[PDB]
Symmetry: C3
Subunit: 288 residues, 3 copies
């Protein structure tokens, strides 16, 4: 909540609207390595976070920290290239700030992507996990983008999250993967947000396994929470860039340079998939 106020989201929404011919319907937050999706846009208009009025600017990236509009598979999009994370210092009400403006920009659906670790044994690095649920660890402790006075203008005080990932789109997703007649079926599991920038220890990965998590990451959850709070259809995927959970001879135990999950390769796939998916996102035209 804090730091920003409604006119803050209202001045930014307007600044963008009055600076772009585009009026986005779908907002797409690309995860690490998935920024490529921006290339798929047409009639694109690239704004620098830096440029936009109250938009948090990047801590290091910047370049791989831009907001591009345009179109994807027949949907007026707006892809945030280079999402913000709590571990960069951004308070969660800066992390999720974009989502609040996308809503005022008219966005009604938010597709978020990310790069997690593979907790579930069945996963194979490279797999794309459809997020069916999430475990908001920072939220349990207090780190929830909604903390602070509730702005009924955006939504409720106690919004529910048991319905976060829109059954419909998840269906249309599982179907679509099948339409394409793909190899490894679109995975589906719970994503566990873990704040910290360092990577989990074996002992930690195991508690994440026990907790129910399928993939671990340091983002998404914040954007999903406030998006839902605004009443935004939300669905997303998680590129499984690696995996671990074994003391009994770590062997590899990751590093990060390991995270790439056949970089170009898989990143390209999750991207095309999301793009194909634009056609399964209800058009504000009601369609009938």
């Amino acid at each position: 909540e804090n730091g920003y106020t409604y006119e803050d989201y209202k001045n930014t929404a307007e600044w963008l609207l009055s600076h772009t011919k585009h009026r986005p319907q779908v907002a797409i937050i690309c995860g690490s390595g998935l920024g490529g999706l921006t290339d798929k846009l047409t009639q694109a208009q690239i704004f620098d976070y830096s440029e936009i009025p109250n938009f948090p600017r990047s801590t290091v990236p910047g370049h791989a920290g831009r907001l591009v509009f345009g179109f994807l598979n027949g949907r007026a999009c707006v892809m945030m290239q280079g999402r913000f994370h709590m571990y960069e210092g951004y308070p969660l009400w800066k992390v999720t700030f974009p989502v609040r403006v996308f809503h005022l920009l008219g966005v009604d659906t938010l597709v978020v992507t990310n790069a997690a670790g593979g907790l579930n044994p069945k996963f194979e690095v490279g797999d794309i996990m459809l997020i069916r649920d999430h475990i908001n660890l920072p939220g349990f402790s207090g780190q929830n983008p909604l903390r602070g006075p509730n702005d009924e203008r955006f939504g409720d005080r106690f919004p529910a999250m048991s319905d976060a990932y829109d059954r419909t789109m998840r269906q249309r997703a599982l179907s679509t993967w099948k339409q394409m007649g793909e190899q490894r079926e679109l995975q589906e599991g719970t994503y566990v947000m873990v704040a910290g920038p360092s990577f989990e220890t074996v002992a930690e990965c195991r508690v994440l396994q026990k907790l129910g998590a399928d993939a671990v990451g340091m983002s998404t959850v914040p954007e999903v929470i406030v998006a839902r709070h605004c009443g935004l259809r939300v669905f997303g995927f998680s590129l499984i860039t690696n995996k671990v959970i074994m003391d009994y001879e770590s062997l590899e135990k990751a590093n990060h340079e390991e995270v790439l999950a056949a970089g170009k390769q898989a990143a390209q796939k999750l991207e095309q998939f999301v793009s194909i998916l634009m056609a399964s996102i209800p058009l504000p035209d009601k369609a009938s």
Copy 2:
């Protein structure tokens, strides 16, 4: 700890004492929907949080955010109507601030109430759960009202919480329910504080089940911790206003308007019960 200092709790305690004929023995924090208990008071004196010197004022409520004194079943009380929550922005050392003044006001027992979600399957919405234990999730991460320099004037650095809910009063509680010859027996389980304002997801509810929790809420724990820190007899109940933990067809999955647990109905019951309970709280007169 932070923000306030001893004279802060000392000026407020005195301001109240020198503004009320009353000298409370029991302090009662009413949960959402349980504010009605204030009606049961006699010779009551309603102060507005706003009015009291260093007392955190409400973020939105205010009205359903008052401090009323008076008497309940032969006990000099002081009921905080409209408790503060971490999710409203209040730092935990503002949430629990009242408890620290109640102690300086002479309060020796603190009965807290709340409205949780029903994790334990045996629970039936409407049930009243006697809190036998708690799992302080925000505490594990750092969100503990005691964090900061310890004020030995109030208590220890490392107070123990394994004894928080006073065996005695829990006994007298289970007995009392039986005296009244009630229907569903006074439930008894562990309350898990979860900070965030949004509601838990199915995936989250399950980790709360696995963790051992019986009911989920966003308060109480902070007040119980510092109350105990002062050396205050503490016991409390949790009105089960709902329940969930099922992906396999959510069906209802809550909302909040669902939370009421037969509002007037059950809220009234937990209230009378607490009031009857005043008679089972040791009188400072030692009684003998």
Copy 3:
């Protein structure tokens, strides 16, 4: 991260270096009750945290809050007597600050010690637990000393922790215990950091058991994370000063005055052990 900057760690490192003839190789953070190890030092030079430029000063202790150099078993040491904890108010980037200067002082190995609770049933108060892994609970929520912009000068953005406690030294540790031909074998388990100053409840201890933890404490984890981030060999022990996990008649349920684990007795033992251990820490001379 925050608050300090590189010249901050650079001015302090230099201030110390230009104020001590010593150039530490090993940095030893002593836990509560283990400050005695300082006595084992020779040619020792005691600086007051207070004295050192940007060094966080103690909240209460101070005296039992000093930085002593000198030598231990043929290793140029620097023992921080009286470590900082998150529960004293110190932001984690003050807690771990010393580690960042020890690195600039040339320290290459960090041996941390602490006093936990005994979660694992096999443990007997007095036991010394070799830390083989850790569960960073405050980290999951956001409380990670690395949060904020990454300083590539010190290390990576996403350092891994699956390798934190250096296999080698753990081996040399288990062996050494055996060399000495001791009684109860050097225990080995996962340490779970829990922030809060109050002690865990029975309900909490059980989730710590389920999570996988073997011993609970309120420190170490922060120092281990940034030490590893700098690329510092890290290993440590945990003096088991007590234990609990039982509603079914608490009986003792601790207090803190119980924590001592045969104070002088066991504290002395873990100390001599660490000192003997100086001989198993690779000398920067490469040794060959």
